[PDB]
């Protein structure tokens, strides 16, 4: 039984087996070792495209799967996410995917269960499958970490997948860089270096946008101009390299971090990084369940 | 891969070879041709039995089913419908079944995405798989189209179904009547003859009725009167021909629109149309996928 | 056609064929009389921990399942659930098993309706799979009720379930005690006897815990210190006999009820009772469809 709660707890090693083995099962391998086993989905924070992503995943491996969005009438009750577990263990639940609003809810869970826990997201954010279909995408393009440029942009401060790809990328043996509005971004970062989105477009292997959202303080940092202001135009993206892709993990705030053509013009791979999203959390099941 | 949008859309032979078909499959023929294909229920607006019918018809099918129920969290966080349809075919969706609030949401859609659309509503209230079963019903009874007196009863001018049924009821070479309050009609053509629902259930060979909504109810008063005004009462249906049925889509507003007793009558076929929608439903999915 | 309504109307013979029956399945027994057909769970009010257990039982039986969560459109659209059921038996389900908040509402289902229903709580708190997994679990543990001492503990007057298992446990043998507040106790009662939990430890073969839930309405009863005056404690769970077991229907609200280190001691089938509950609903859904 492997959980999976972040990327830093996986080897570079393991990485990049997942990598592989969810290029071969994109490439058709395929068998019947998971077939009738049982996946629960526990999405006490809900993510429909997250959500459905690990059920098609789950579904071509030939698993039954138990659905929950939102609140459960048990932890209603006040329910420990422990006795969830549990509970799903005793009726004959293999593996849960959770996405759960608090902080690290797995450190303490993953040495006390029995089946094995996917951290689909968790309260301070980390989100390993993403970065894995992420780094999964990179790969194919270039097959090899070593010596990329990787530009992340938005609200790195509260982003903590922007930050966890920012680090296992350096890991990787890539260089990152960072734009977005100051106020966003983490004064003392130890991978990325902080620059303009005018420069890291022509520095760039590699283009990342986050969505940027709406909420915190006052600052709401006028999503109407944002795209201009901070964001992938058009004009900035002709000044990408010939080679150089874009990368978002959706969902698109068209007209904001990019300019609607540019979703699918030819250096985007958004869609492809959702291809890929099933075949990194197959990957991700069979290793949560190999014996 | 074909899409089922609106009514208007089939030609007559179409409409006829999905009624075979269904009545095909009602009689037990089944293949494995879409055996572990996947089917997303998209109703972004709520409707239960309809959602139920569809499902069916995909598990039938031996398909994987995603479903989503209500509002999607990657809409709230602003995606069109086209990025959902195309996240969809990434994820690797072979068929979405749609239920959305906004008018003709499909057109836009049907010239961008690249799998099969399946309309179960849009903002319009076009709703063709409805039709096709009150036609497959029909059919069932009868045998033919031509020649039959068809008459629709209720809130005409609000109810696209009801318009699209007559529309394409006459393509087929019956008569269509229409009755109910004149406020409610809309009688610029609309392809059938208004005349009084005493005089339409002594004609009629099928007697069709709409959901008086409570919405279009002026008064609890027009609400409790309706029956005996405008409705199918006892005394009405005891005047109905010898070979004549009673249809509606459900759900039924017993003591308005028709007498609590009538519902499960001889005449009555509002049940059998259920049975047929789910058959109408696998029939349209094989169309939708054919290769 | 078989349903299940309350633990009243099986007999004592039905309910040992039952327990032998998910006996059986628990030992893996298993066949194909089920694959493919349809089962709805219709939780009109939700019990997650419930449903998940029902729909483990139907998928192990190879059945296709339908869910519902919460409110139904077309109820809210006023349909009985009369027209409901009959709108399922339409479109193909089997079986229907039902949470709903109207008190026996089953009762007028259960002469109207062609399909079996499965009772999984309905107003009064009838919930019979509860009480049936309850009873394996004893009847595992000491092969028999006769002469077993059953005490039951915890607001006994606000519990259909605690109420429900002493009746039931009376008819197949065995004593029934209650403790708890006094005020909680259902003075009226014919099946139990009112004691300390300090004495019913001792006397005790089995101690079935109920959830202390907040309620603050003349059973304003501290949930602070309700462990130590009320609850069992460390110390009186050390003074239980040697083969006598600890039972709850979860979730459990550690620390009032019980000790928190209790919950997984050497004498707990708390999670035992979970594991139950899922071939006592396969027992019980084979039992509806049989011949």
Same mark, same amino acid.
């Given at each position: ?29 395929? %068998? ?45 009750? @006040? ?6 577990? #549990? ?29 094995? !826990? ?44 922007? #930050? ?15 734009? @977005? ?16 989105? %005018?420069?890291? $477009? ?9 969505? !940027? ?28 390299? #010939? ?15 990019? %300019? ?17 999203? $099933? ?13």
């Amino acid at each position: 039984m492997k959980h999976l709660t972040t990327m830093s707890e996986l080897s570079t090693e393991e990485i990049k087996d997942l990598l592989q083995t969810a290029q071969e099962l994109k490439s058709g391998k395929t %068998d019947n070792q998971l077939t009738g086993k049982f996946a629960a989905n526990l999405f006490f924070e809900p993510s429909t495209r997250t959500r459905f992503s690990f059920e098609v995943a789950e579904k071509k491996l030939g698993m039954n799967v138990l659905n929950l969005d939102g609140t459960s009438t048990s932890v209603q009750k @006040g329910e420990t996410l422990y006795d969830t577990i #549990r509970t799903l263990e005793s009726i004959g639940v293999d593996v849960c995917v959770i996405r759960h609003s608090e902080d690290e809810y797995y450190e303490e869970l993953v040495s006390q269960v029995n089946i094995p !826990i996917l951290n689909a997201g968790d309260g301070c954010g980390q989100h390993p499958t993403q970065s894995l279909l992420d780094l999964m995408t990179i790969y194919e393009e270039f097959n090899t970490f070593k010596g990329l440029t990787v530009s992340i942009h938005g609200d790195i401060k509260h982003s903590r997948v922007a #930050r966890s790809n920012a680090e296992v990328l350096t890991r990787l043996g890539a260089r990152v860089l960072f734009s @977005g509005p100051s106020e966003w971004q983490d004064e003392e970062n130890t991978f990325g270096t902080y620059v303009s989105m %005018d420069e890291a $477009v022509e520095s760039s292997d590699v283009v990342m946008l986050l969505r !940027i959202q709406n909420e915190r303080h006052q600052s709401a940092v006028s999503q109407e101009g944002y795209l201009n202001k901070y964001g992938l135009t058009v004009e900035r993206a002709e000044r990408m390299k #010939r080679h150089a892709i874009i990368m978002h993990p959706a969902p698109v705030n068209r007209g904001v971090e990019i %300019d609607d053509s540019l979703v699918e013009s030819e250096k985007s791979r958004i869609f492809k990084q959702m291809k890929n999203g $099933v075949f990194i959390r197959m990957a991700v099941i069979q290793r949560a369940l190999q014996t």
